[PDB]
């Protein structure tokens, strides 16, 4: 028995000895239904399970649950029912199952996306709609089409433009069973020969789900300082080889990237590994600014006109994140001076 | 429940009881009917001194089980005389001895494995087999405790073993009030505590006090009362509490700030007011709003301009419970791989408080910058660039301030795009500012007009610290030459 | 006080006495009536030759306690014949011997421990012995 079929040496596999092999993978929906039916046999035999439970719903709710997690779920549900009974003819009921529903290892986690998706998305113009539409088309292509198992993409733009939120919003809507994020701020102090292992291990999980999606954000930090070109070669090679590896037969992927320095990447021969690329621009006209201000919902009509009468004349160039920072800061002044200070600050860029 | 004397652990205790002990107290016939095994592990983690062991021992007595036996990680690790397996076996020996002697209905035996982070390396196998293997003991329970949750390896966490986790954090105000009410019970019972003490005030004065500090405070107050009585029907009173009020670990110490804030601040002109007002606005924003849990800023300007004092002043006026300074003169001679650890550890503590502020000063000396051919450190630069955008765990807040005298060199390294906003601290640039500074300090007297007649003609360019140095030096002359020498020295700049 | 042969250490002695020993001289009934644990350690630091050990010994005689026994850091550190633990155990031998046999009324014993070499940037066994499952109320450790 082993979890690493690669590292066994050839000596044991030649015929006459250890002649057979098999793979025991994650069960699919029928397997899950059968395991659930197996584990709750005795309770239904003695009539402690209520009549409202329907196994076929748990069969479809628990995606990418392994063998042991189902048993754990049932045990936790029974424990919760007992506790409720004792008050801190009992019958485990649907509510306990819902409440109890454990963390799957190969499933989805909520805390990470909560951390990378902070204030959602606000449609302040055409570019946002265009980017969302392209993301949706890519997700559909990877889910339905059969001639393209692997699909890649790279979002890029100026600093403070709104990339990471867009990537997490595109990925989190796919409803794929397996979603994972590889980030540079989980590897503070690691050496290069540990970054390679971490990346490889993260990738070697997405090959064991019938669908998946992986996020690689801030590529420039995984490698770069321009006081003399200094970077790492090991990480660059392992990343350049992993972006064209194909999964085993019948499984599908989707790798979304991110970066703020496109020219440096172009020089290093990396723009030819990503299938396609997308641009995320900055605010460029007063009308976009007024749209964003109205959507956020901070200033009122009279302040709106006061700001418009001045801002409309010139054109501006400011990322969305900076506009959120400033409009948040100005609010702390007394109600008299909010408009004046906000206009002064914006005028300083 | 109050008899165990645990306060501030209502939710954690409730959930632990629900998940881990509901089965064992239910009538045996029904649980035998449903045929569900019992949990077989618990993992507690948090900052040191918050009440983990005192919870395990009370959980031990709650079930009316046998008294526990303890173990320590490094103590077991170093034994390599053939005892590495013997220790593991002997601990469980009694459990299986009684299981065979009676059977399945033997009473449960607890064992407490402290410092479990040491066993797991980023000895294990035998323990793991014994807790769950071909043979199993249905009459044991294991409780782990640790302070470094990350370094436990995945092997112990898969379901079926050490199935539960809980986090024991610093108490909030209600927890502190309850602990204080717990610890002074007996004295008030025997009427030795005076009638002037009000616990609700100590509840609001002791911010970010952990579990043990409150007990230490009470003991120190009692000692002071005794000492007063004996003169170097006694009653501890408010004065003893105030006098005794111990140095917290996650709190504010005045000594550092005394060292960096030496002579206050003098409003000699508009830029000072501008800087202070901007600091106040930033503090308010990071305190009140919930759409920006991280805010950064960088004060920069020419040498000898007055940066460190303003940063410290802004920090101290906030009133945040947790304040710290990461300065590069506490690391004389360290190698790079120790600077990284020191910085990481200074940051990793600010995440365990509901508010905080961290001041990074003299950036260019952390990197070891020297312009005779560009030499610097890459480990520190990377470890510092990653941390300036790390977001704190859910519901907490953080504010970082910077400092530097070489801006453009930083701009070349692509660092200014990590700091949200920047401020400028200018020097003295007109004779009026110079006269106002001289008057505010209050050193010279007629001599003011003598100085003005000459200074007013020209424009000057001199930092505030240098001016303080000159005006302090000239005073040692005899009285009738002071003004003359002050002019001479200044004219050399 | 002047019979102790110490001058220029009034403040330090007074503060140490107040914080560490005020409870050990008050009538036993009252201190038992309030339920307070006794302090279990001290730390004295300074430049060489300013009068530290002579204060430890004088404090030893102040309480009328049993005479102390001393140890040296680098001496203990090098011993790796399995006695790294046996030495530590036999150090507190007398206090352990008397505690289980006389309880509250035991006569407190002292030990004088270069503690900075041990703490490197053998700690754990000593730490457990001073405060572990067992907690002798008749020991006092001065570093
Ligand atoms: N349409 C939008 N697109 C992107 N972000 C938006 C939008 N509307 C509001 N936001 C908010 O703007 C912020 C986006 O910042 P983001 O995480 O994209 O930074 P970033 O571009 O990666 O920064 P940096 O270059 O400094 O690393 C989030 O707080 C998000 O909620
Ligand atoms: N308005 C003011 N702003 C700053 N410092 C002031 C002001 N008024 C008086 N001072 C005094 O000026 C001194 C400031 O020196 P400071 O500690 O800022 O040096 P620094 O800028 O860190 O030095 P360096 O550039 O050499 O590293 C303090 O002694 C402070 O009391
Ligand atoms: N409710 C409480 N929370 C935290 N500490 C408490 C509480 N009540 C009492 N204490 C005191 O805290 C001290 C230290 O607890 P300890 O068991 O050492 O925790 P840890 O092992 O995490 O340091 C104990 O000696 C105890 O008297
Ligand atoms: N008041 C005093 N302060 C300091 N040293 C004193 C005082 N009175 C006497 N001594 C001398 O100090 C010497 C002992 O110093 P010692 O305790 O060995 O220093 P250390 O504690 O650094 O080893 C004795 O020889 C004694 O004569």
Numbering used by the authors:
A (entry chain F): 372 to 459, 472 to 484, 488 to 609, 611 to 736
B (entry chain E): 215 to 336, 350 to 459, 472 to 484, 488 to 687, 689 to 736
C (entry chain D): 215 to 327, 329 to 336, 350 to 371
Sentences from the paper on this structure:
We observed heptameric states of Sec18 and NSF, split-open hexameric states of Sec18 and NSF and a transition between split hexamer and heptamer of Sec18. We found that both could process the species-ortholog SNARE complex, albeit at different rates, further corroborating the interchangeability of NSF and Sec18. Thus, the heptameric state, which is unable to process substrate, may not occur in the cell, as there is likely an abundance of cis-SNARE substrate and ATP to capture. We conclude that NSF/Sec18 is mostly hexameric in the cell unless there is a substantial dearth of substrate to process.
SNARE (soluble N-ethylmaleimide-sensitive factor (NSF) attachment protein receptor) proteins drive membrane fusion at different cell compartments as their core domains zipper into a parallel four-helix bundle.
